Design a protein around this ligand. Structure first.
Ligand SMILES: OC[C@H]1NC[C@H](O)[C@@H](O)[C@@H]1O[C@H]1O[C@H](CO)[C@@H](O)[C@H](O)[C@H]1O
Ligand SMILES: [Ca+2]
Ligand code: NA
Length: 708
């Protein structure tokens, strides 16, 4: 057959999944499986999920489906289906497999290290649950402080486990560490930082994990073979993972807890964004077992195409498209979230993503979306389709994309990671730097500044602190290098937080978070076969290893000692003044941005009217490619801001002359120590010169010239 002919003939638009009705008394089951000869539901005990309690056949229905009603008449010995578990038994040409219901609302505790025992253990078992009845009943969409449209968002990227896995805070947690409800206890920190949106790394069920050990601390340094998972191996798109639950064996508990966490985010004036991973599953069979050669993108001969060890969901195909859309709609409606971040959004066709936006916006008119817009489309063989990537930005003002051009130009990025760049001693085309800061990157067309997600660090790759230390080749274990890296960190964060577009902050990017592999047996280089997986070894200018030379660049499979957010470094001004200085700088930066809409203009036409480059490349001691930059915004209220950056290692002068002499009785809103929306009484790192203005080495400033 062909997915195209199968859509023509078995396209189905009714409800899917298991609806727990009648306060537990009844379950209506629907599963799309056109090719099946028989379908039964195997029901597993809620007290012992290994225990099969009975097996009920389903009967054929409309357009390829199979339907059944579990009720009073069951021989199962069940009067309340709540919390019982199920999988689908599907027989085709005499062979039987057990399948996960793709519309499962929750799941039994899952442990992939037991997957080999039998068929029943190869995929998760779904749970009969009713989301609506669970958690805070007053939960609704966020009402987000300081936020009106996408350009207004400040996005903060956190993993649920990392945010509370620091043993250093065990003393202050009343909830089990690294769970949804533990996350709630550190929310006051994020409200004080001033971010509008917390983007959570994938919370939907993922495959490679033993959830039954989720309370064990991963205190040993490791970067491969860890029970920790970022979660980029999807198993189900409606069910939450049990890894962040106080009890993975209670199928309802993760729902209440998540609903309560989204509610707490909301009450603090912030929104939640959900990292979602629709481009690939963890295993080809997750959907191949459901309906052969349909769900995935495929070669011409119907072979499923593959990504990260699993299958590529072909969102061009009717049931796969609706899987994506129903999941989006269900997550927005059930958990009342404020947005989504699409993983490898370029793997998807534009139309799917567009319709996902429209359906999510129909539920929550203030929802935003961004994704990875890399040009990666693979699709069906011989069926080119317009993709939801960077080149799509010129045909839509809906879902924004990450900017690799600013990331690459400022510190490093693929394919030149670790090479000196704007904030790391490597000079850059000044026009290019400026075009990035006004949210016109040079590697794709952004016809609105809200198309652009501006970032210099994320969960992927070396953290901002780590990348800078690698790039300038200075070992942070020397007080003077530590201080220099921070000076550079602040510079970068200033550049992003004052740029047009939507700024994105990796959790910890505010304090100088590191993923240095500080294992006691790894103070110095070790033999080849013991080198930590996903590491880089860091060296100084003479080529001598760093003290603890190995640092992790892909921590998807690393332990708490690698992945924990460091609370002491982030909050203890006495024990770590540089880190806390950095954190306070970010806080002021976000406050600065939020005090005016000069940094967050709403159109391309308005950006070109109001922002003008001051450091013209070539002129006044400013090389065509350099490590300095200066520019001006005329705000909508007529105030005039200027941003000046000196990422050089010597004092450097910015020429003002008569054209920009009005910048002289400016108030200074940021300097080398601090940032904020209010004038710094005694500004440091600035000197007024005859020609214009002198900035100390590794120093940035923001000015505002009022007439008021
Ligand atoms: O989902 C694949 C990748 N998409 C971009 C994300 O930001 C990445 O973190 C993600 O990759 C990570 O997860 C995969 C799948 O488990 C792993 O193989 C990668 O090495 C890891 O970076
Ligand atoms: Ca656009
Ligand atoms: Na890197």
């Amino acid at each position: 057959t062909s997915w195209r002919l199968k859509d023509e003939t078995y396209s189905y638009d009714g409800k899917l999944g298991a609806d727990l009705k009648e306060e537990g008394k009844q379950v209506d089951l629907t599963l799309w499986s056109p090719s099946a000869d028989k379908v039964s539901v195997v029901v597993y005990d809620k007290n012992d999920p290994d225990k099969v309690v009975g097996t009920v056949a389903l009967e054929k229905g409309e357009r390829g489906t199979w339907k059944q009603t579990l009720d009073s008449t069951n021989k199962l010995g069940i009067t309340d289906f709540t919390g019982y578990y199920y999988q689908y038994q599907i027989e085709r040409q005499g062979k039987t497999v057990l399948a996960l219901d793709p519309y499962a609302k929750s799941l039994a505790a899952w442990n992939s290290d037991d997957s080999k025992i039998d068929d029943a253990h190869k995929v998760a078992k779904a749970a009969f649950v009713d989301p609506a009845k669970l958690g805070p009943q007053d939960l609704t969409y966020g009402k987000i402080h300081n936020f009106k449209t996408r350009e207004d968002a400040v996005i903060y990227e956190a993993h649920v486990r990392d945010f509370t896995s620091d043993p250093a805070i065990a003393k202050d947690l009343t909830k089990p560490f690294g769970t949804f409800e533990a996350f709630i206890e550190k929310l006051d920190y994020l409200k004080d930082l001033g971010v509008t949106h917390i983007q959570l790394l994938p919370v939907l069920s993922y495959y490679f994990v033993n959830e039954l050990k989720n309370h064990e601390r991963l205190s040993d340094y490791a970067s491969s073979n860890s029970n920790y998972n970022w979660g980029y191996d999807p198993q189900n798109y409606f069910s939450l993972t049990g890894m962040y639950s106080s009890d993975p064996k209670n199928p309802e508990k993760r729902i209440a807890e998540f609903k309560n966490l989204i509610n707490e985010i909301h009450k603090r004036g912030m929104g939640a964004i959900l990292d979602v991973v629709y481009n690939h599953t963890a295993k080809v069979d997750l959907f191949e077992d459901l309906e052969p050669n349909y769900y995935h993108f495929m070669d011409a001969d119907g072979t499923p195409r593959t990504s990260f060890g699993g299958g590529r969901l072909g969102t061009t195909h009717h049931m796969t498209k609706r899987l994506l859309i129903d999941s989006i709609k269900y997550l927005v409606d059930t958990y009342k979230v404020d947005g989504f971040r699409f993983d490898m959004m370029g793997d998807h066709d534009a139309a799917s993503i567009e319709e996902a936006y429209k359906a999510a916006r129909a539920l929550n008119p203030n929802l935003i979306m961004l994704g990875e817009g890399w040009r990666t489309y693979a699709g069906d063989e011989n069926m080119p389709t317009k993709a939801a990537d960077q080149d799509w930005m010129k045909h839509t003002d809906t879902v924004a994309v990450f900017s690799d051009d600013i990331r690459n130009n400022l510190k490093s990025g693929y394919p030149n990671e670790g090479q000196p760049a704007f904030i790391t001693g490597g000079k850059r085309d000044v026009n290019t730097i400026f075009k990035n800061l006004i949210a016109q990157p040079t590697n794709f067309e952004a016809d609105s500044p809200g198309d652009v997600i501006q970032y210099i660090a994320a969960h992927d790759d070396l953290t901002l602190f780590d990348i800078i230390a690698q790039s300038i080749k200075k070992d942070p274990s020397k007080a003077e290098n530590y201080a220099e890296i921070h000076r550079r960190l602040r510079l970068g964060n200033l550049m992003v937080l004052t740029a047009q577009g939507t700024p994105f902050i990796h959790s910890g990017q505010e304090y100088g978070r590191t993923k240095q592999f500080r294992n006691p047996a790894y103070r110095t280089p070790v033999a080849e076969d013991k080198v930590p997986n996903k590491s880089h070894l860091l060296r100084d200018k003479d080529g001598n290893p760093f003290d603890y030379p190995y640092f992790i660049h892909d921590s998807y499979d690393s332990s708490d000692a690698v992945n924990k957010f460091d609370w002491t470094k982030a909050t203890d001004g006495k024990a770590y003044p540089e880190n806390v200085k950095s954190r306070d700088y970010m806080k002021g930066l976000i406050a600065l941005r939020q005090s005016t809409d000069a940094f967050r203009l709403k159109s391309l036409q308005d950006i070109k009217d109001r922002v003008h480059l001051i450091t013209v490349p070539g002129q006044n001691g400013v090389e065509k490619e350099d490590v300095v930059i200066g520019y001006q915004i005329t705000a909508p209220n007529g105030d005039i801001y200027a941003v000046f950056v000196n990422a050089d290692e010597k004092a450097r002068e910015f020429n003002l002359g008569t054209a920009f002499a009005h910048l002289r009785n400016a108030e200074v809103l940021a300097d080398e120590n601090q940032a904020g929306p209010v004038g710094i009484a005694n500004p440091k790192g600035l000197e007024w010169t005859e020609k214009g203005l002198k900035l100390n080495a590794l120093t940035a400033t923001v000015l505002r010239v009022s007439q008021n």
